[PDB]
Design a protein around this ligand. Structure first.
Ligand code: TRD
Ligand code: TRD
Lengths: 146, 143
DNA sequence: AATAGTTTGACTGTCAAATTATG
DNA sequence: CATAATTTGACAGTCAAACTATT
């Protein structure tokens, strides 16, 4: 039997209203207290893709380049990232995480890992495989709606 | 693999916000953010909710709520009414316009969710339901 | 002393527009 | 002229702390 729509709606509403606040609260209680969840997203892009450029971070985060530049200025000032001028094209900037950046990037991954482990709690390996297919299908449905 | 589950969850979450934003900005209510829609929905679902209860539900400070409520009240979506039993207390209620957008928003969400469920296999729905429950509980356990 | 709500000052996140340098 | 980035201007949204009013 399907879940009641009322319960579905209730769960989705809690999740969408609170998930970014809960993630921010977890970072603010960490040993690094000067990084917001939005800055953590910028850190995340750079950590996964060393030498990425501001333009690529912009496309990946779906905000304008001015917005990315401001965030990078705060993050460089606070010691989490370094900007490096390209030697091929002198218009281009390559970004990479400082050691401090790598440390907090790791910490944000433990959170994501705890979340996925709770998501699959009680599921068998075949249910997990089905859940994987469910997510790609839900993802694909939403992609086609924009 | 946990990292790619995470990649899908983030893209899904991000797509949902994009789709909500486009539907809002394409509507006849062009002065309402996604966050204000959330506040309207809290008040619509619980008539006479107080600012403190809104603050608890959305997990923002009360001052942030007051500011938002001033904006929504100015723009014609909500009304504040002082409690007759305790005059420190404010009860919130949607205006006619607030009920209209609330009703249109609930319909939009229901249709979309039903459409999504319609395209899934019985086994997908069983397990997506269990993951939704678990995700809800993960967050609820951190509050 | 306590509680519910508001106001205030500062800062982030965000986009558009104007700007600097480079191709 | 196009591209990559930055800076500026102008707004929401947010928090912490101070304040007001009421119990
Ligand atoms: C508002 C659109 C996002 C909703 C997608 C989530 C749907 C969850 C369905 C779970 C099925 C449980 C029965
Ligand atoms: C920050 C991303 C986590 C929130 C993702 C919510 C998406 C809702 C999909 C529900 C299905 C879960 C199995």
């Amino acid at each position: 039997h399907h879940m009641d729509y009322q319960r579905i709606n209730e769960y989705l509403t809690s999740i969408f209203n609170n998930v970014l606040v809960i993630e921010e609260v977890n970072l603010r209680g960490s040993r690094f207290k000067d990084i917001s969840i939005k800055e953590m997203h910028t850190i995340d892009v750079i950590g996964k893709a060393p030498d990425v450029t501001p333009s690529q971070v912009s496309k990946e985060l779906m905000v304008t380049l001015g917005t990315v530049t401001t965030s990078l200025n705060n993050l460089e000032r606070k010691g989490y990232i370094e900007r490096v001028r390209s030697e091929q094209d002198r218009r281009v900037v390559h970004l990479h995480l400082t050691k401090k950046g790598r440390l907090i990037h790791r910490l944000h991954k433990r959170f994501h890992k705890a979340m996925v482990e709770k998501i699959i709690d009680g599921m068998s390996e075949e249910e997990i495989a089905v859940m994987g297919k469910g997510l790609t299908n839900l993802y694909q449905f939403l992609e086609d709606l924009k």
